[PDB]
Design a protein around this ligand. Structure first.
Ligand SMILES: [Mg+2]
Ligand SMILES: [Mg+2]
Ligand SMILES: [Mg+2]
Ligand SMILES: [Mg+2]
Ligand SMILES: [Mg+2]
Ligand SMILES: [Mg+2]
Ligand SMILES: [Mg+2]
Ligand SMILES: [Mg+2]
Ligand SMILES: [Mg+2]
Ligand SMILES: [Zn+2]
Lengths: 135, 176, 94, 136, 38, 134
RNA sequence: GAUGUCGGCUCAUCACAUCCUGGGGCUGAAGUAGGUCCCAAGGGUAUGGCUGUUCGCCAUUUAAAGUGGUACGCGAGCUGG
RNA sequence: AGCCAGGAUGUUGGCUUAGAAGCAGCCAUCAUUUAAAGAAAGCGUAAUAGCUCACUGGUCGAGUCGGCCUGCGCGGAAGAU
């Protein structure tokens, strides 16, 4: 049973990490075992990404403070967030291989530069290399 | 109540005839007629059917709820249609249709003959499978129960007439 | 702050008290100080819900008897022998 | 089984069991079992109830028995005519008026005390209620 | 069927139902839990 | 598909592995020598877990896992058998340096993100077997 | 200023707390056979050895050998152990 | 409330036992990845598997839950013309 003191606390934690991160991936995680999840939670901490399954009412609140205030229409259906804090990219590629290899889910919408990325044009943040490539 | 307040959408090519408490719902699959309880007030209006209690009737909302549920499956009836699937389990158990009669071999001395009623129609895709089809949800449910009644699933091997969707729990016989 | 609403009693004794309880009310008294004791009547349900909060017996209560506010403290309570009801309350002026 | 160690007299007049109880408040524990009806509790009934609640709390906590069977009850045997003296003492009872706190318990959570008291209530000839201690 | 004065739910799957003015216990999980007040 | 724990230099006897894996459809001589050819690096007297992945053609593929948590806490404390009543009877002792030695090997099977996360997961296996942290 | 007692015979009549037969739930009900519970009073419900016995034990039957009420049914009906 | 998804890892926890791998018992009952998941509320296996619950994310869209003081009812309730 989630209390309001606890609901406000979850909004706070995801509001803080919202400003800090660079690129974020919003996706479906239906019909996938915890065996595959603890696997994507390992390669997620390695790539410098923040993984979370947050209540969509709670997310529309911790994203109203911008620059993700276009991820609104992505808070329909089950949502997992991939906030990339250390180096932009990482997750937008970590998820794409997980989506094809498991066949379950589709991946909703991505966010970078404070702009909307549809389910079709997720090839932009999936081809990007390192930071750390310009030298 | 939550059921009664929910309206029933009458589609294209579906005729609704309301002469007081008598409702005739005609469609592609057939023609079903029902008499609603005197506590139900059925309003036509638009491409929907709305149900509500009648003034001075104590169980009004309970009655309107039933009426709604019935008229919904009456529409679904005369359009889509209903399907009950039975499957015969056990050595020798076989079934076949000859028009409006289901012939059954269910381990008795005499072979069973079951006269289907007006509207219910059956076909056997296998010797061990029966598929029933009709517009009246009550009648199809009745016929499938009557066919099951002949040989109800025994708890030691699961032998007998079972519903396709049926979960037949079995048990071990007494030890010693 | 617990606020209690009360009327002064028009009647006294066995007969009148039993009649009060039959009407979902109960007698109570306010004593202490230079002032003469004041026999009052209370709403049963209201004081019953209050007395459930532990603080009722420790805190200073205010009894509104015909506009006038009286600062008191719960002195003694007479409870029903087996039902979750109140028979009488002694309130000492604080 | 409770019973007075000695008595001033062996037998006692029937008497009557009128009025309301004395000892209507949880005075030692946190929870109590209060009598709502009127009647007699026999030493065997008191023991049956006490055993049931003790099993219930798996011998954790503390139990108080607020009642004591101190009334001797006589009985005249079969095929014996009337008169020829007062009967012989067969058993002992404690007279119960509505309001009596019968048993008290502490050292156990309310949920368990309520269970234990439901189990003991079943062995008693009179209607009972669960009671909690109060501030005055 | 168990016919007794005191009918109760025995498991989570037990259900109290009043059929024809008779309190009954119907159960999906255990047939042994089937009761009729009487 | 079955989960078993076979010795570092031993895999062949009938009572532990015999009719346990042989009933499904796995070769008793093909697996017994291919497992010990890869677990030759693993120290003598240490139970090592192995998971079997079988197909419809009786074929098999296995991936060796790191030794168990209740297994490595017996050699570090100096005990052959654990306690019958844990946290009621003490059988041995393990330091904070020995706790990080069990976790640095188990890192391939552990769910933890940091060293402190993998260490606390071995702290729990020690408490529930009678062993006390000293 | 009299209401004949136990048992038997003859003849019954009711209750159902059902012995058999009928319907049916659960079973620690595979079948056969049982256990227990519910519905049911339509009909049916041994002969002998011993004893005044009712009862009971015993023998051999039977689908079963029911439990009770009827002035412990029935002497202006019989018997008289 | 219903319906969709998950209900994991260390780990088959330790002891015991031919085996006990949440699920014969006995003792402890933490910790990790966490949206959440009891060292496991019940059924199943020779032991595993396999099915479901506690708990949590999605859908839905406005009520819902159960204690208290009380009025009147219901079952509990079988007998002999
Ligand atoms: Mg008077
Ligand atoms: Mg009926
Ligand atoms: Mg005369
Ligand atoms: Mg009967
Ligand atoms: Mg019985
Ligand atoms: Mg008869
Ligand atoms: Mg016989
Ligand atoms: Mg006579
Ligand atoms: Mg004569
Ligand atoms: Zn049940």
């Amino acid at each position: 049973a989630l209390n309001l003191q606890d609901k406000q606390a979850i909004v706070a934690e995801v509001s803080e990490v919202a400003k800090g991160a660079l690129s974020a991936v919003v996706a479906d995680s239906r019909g996938v075992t915890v065996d595959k999840m603890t696997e994507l939670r390992k390669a997620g901490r390695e790539a410098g990404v923040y993984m979370r399954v947050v209540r969509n009412t709670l997310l529309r609140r911790a994203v109203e403070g911008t620059p993700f205030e276009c991820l609104k229409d992505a808070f329909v259906g089950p949502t997992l967030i991939a906030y990339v804090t250390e180096h932009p990219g990482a997750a937008a590629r970590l998820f794409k291989e997980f989506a094809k290899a498991n066949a379950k889910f589709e991946v909703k919408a991505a966010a970078f530069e404070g702009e909307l990325i549809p389910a079709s044009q997720i090839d932009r943040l999936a081809t990007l290399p390192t930071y750390e490539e310009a030298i | 109540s939550r059921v009664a307040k929910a309206p029933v959408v009458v589609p294209a090519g579906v005729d609704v005839k309301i002469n007081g408490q008598v409702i005739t719902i005609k469609g592609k699959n057939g023609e079903l007629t029902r008499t609603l309880n005197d506590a139900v007030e059925v309003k036509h209006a638009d491409n929907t059917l709305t149900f509500g209690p009648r003034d001075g009737y104590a169980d009004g909302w309970a009655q309107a709820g039933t009426a709604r549920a019935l008229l919904n499956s009456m529409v679904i009836g005369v359009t889509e249609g209903f399907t009950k699937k039975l499957q015969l389990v056990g050595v020798g158990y076989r079934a076949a249709v000859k028009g409006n009669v289901i012939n059954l071999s269910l381990g008795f001395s005499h072979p069973v003959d079951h006269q289907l009623p007006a509207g219910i129609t059956a076909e056997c895709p296998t010797q061990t499978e029966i598929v029933l089809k009709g517009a009246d949800k009550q009648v199809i449910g009745q016929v499938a129960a009557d066919l099951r009644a002949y040989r109800r699933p025994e708890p030691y091997k699961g032998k007998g007439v079972r519903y396709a969707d049926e979960v037949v729990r079995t048990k071990e016989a007494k030890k010693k | 702050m617990f606020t209690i609403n009360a009327e002064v009693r028009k009647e006294q004794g066995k007969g009148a008290s039993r009649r009060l309880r039959a009407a979902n009310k109960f007698p109570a008294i306010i004593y202490g100080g230079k002032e003469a004791p004041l026999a009052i009547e209370l709403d049963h349900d209201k004081v019953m819900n209050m007395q459930a909060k532990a603080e009722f017996y420790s805190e200073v209560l205010t009894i509104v008897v015909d506009g006038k506010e009286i600062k008191v403290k719960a002195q003694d309570v007479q409870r029903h022998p087996y039902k979750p009801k109140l028979q009488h309350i002694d309130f000492v002026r604080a | 089984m409770l019973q007075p160690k000695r008595t001033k007299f062996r037998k006692m007049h029937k008497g009557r069991n009128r009025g309301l109880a004395q000892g209507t408040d949880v005075s030692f524990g946190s929870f109590g079992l209060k009598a709502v009806g009127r009647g007699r509790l026999t030493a065997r009934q008191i023991e049956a109830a006490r055993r049931a609640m003790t099993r219930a709390v798996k011998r954790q906590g503390k139990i108080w028995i607020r009642v004591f069977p101190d009334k001797p009850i006589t009985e005249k045997p079969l095929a014996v005519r009337m008169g020829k003296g007062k009967g012989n003492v067969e058993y002992w009872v404690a007279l119960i008026q509505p309001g009596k706190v019968l048993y008290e318990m502490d050292g156990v959570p309310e949920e368990l005390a309520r269970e234990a008291f439901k189990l003991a209530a079943a062995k008693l000839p009179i209607k009972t209620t669960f009671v909690t201690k109060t501030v005055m | 069927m168990k016919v007794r004065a005191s009918v109760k739910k025995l498991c989570r799957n037990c259900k109290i139902v009043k059929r024809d003015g008779v309190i009954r216990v119907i159960c999906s999980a255990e047939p042994k839990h089937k009761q009729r007040q009487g | 598909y079955v989960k078993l724990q076979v010795a570092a230099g031993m895999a062949n006897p009938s009572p532990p592995v015999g009719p346990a894996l042989g009933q499904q459809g796995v070769n008793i001589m093909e697996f017994c020598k291919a497992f010990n050819a890869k677990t030759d690096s693993i120290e003598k007297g240490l139970p090592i877990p192995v998971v079997i992945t079988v197909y419809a053609d009786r074929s098999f593929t296995f991936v060796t896992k790191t030794p168990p948590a209740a297994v490595l806490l017996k050699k570090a404390a100096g005990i052959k058998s654990g306690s019958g009543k844990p946290n009621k009877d003490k059988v041995g002792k393990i330091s904070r340096a020995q706790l990080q030695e069990i976790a640095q090997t188990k890192a391939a099977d552990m769910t933890g993100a940091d060293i402190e996360a993998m260490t606390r997961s071995i702290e729990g296996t020690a408490r529930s077997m009678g062993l006390v942290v000293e």
